[PDB]
Design a binder for this molecule. Structure first.
Ligand SMILES: [Zn+2]
Length: 136
């Protein structure tokens, strides 16, 4: 499951819905095996839409769990059109593409910070229901 998905997965126990600790889940980085899918094509327009949607604090938390400590504490901001993007903006976009879309968890384990429920990812598939669309 793509790194991006960790930004939209909360504990499936209904009693946890009211907790501030139901999301994000706590990924066990000692157990999560990561794989790169480089066949996913870079699309800046699509990526800009994605970056706008993510909860940045949860990106930072999960990334650190999975061994990435090179992200800025504030979500990168970008101009309103592709034409206005700098080379530096594009380099950031490329890095975000690699992180959010090309990086997948093939196998792993993650838990609810509120209730301690342990979930699993097997052959890239979590045993918690995936949402049909990604929104906060
Ligand atoms: Zn829970």
């Amino acid at each position: 499951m793509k790194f991006l998905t960790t930004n939209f997965l909360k504990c499936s126990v209904k009693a946890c819905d009211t907790s501030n600790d139901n999301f994000p889940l706590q990924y066990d980085g000692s157990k999560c095996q990561l794989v790169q899918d480089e066949s996913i094509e870079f699309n800046p327009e699509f990526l800009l839409n994605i970056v706008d949607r993510v909860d940045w604090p949860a990106v930072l938390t999960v990334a650190a769990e999975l061994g990435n400590n090179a992200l800025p504490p504030t979500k990168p901001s970008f101009p309103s059109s592709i034409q206005e993007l700098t080379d530096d903006d594009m380099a950031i976009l490329n890095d975000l593409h690699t992180l959010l879309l090309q990086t997948s968890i093939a196998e792993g384990e993650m838990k609810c910070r509120n209730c301690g429920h342990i979930y699993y990812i097997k052959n890239g598939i979590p045993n918690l229901l995936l949402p049909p669309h990604l929104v906060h």
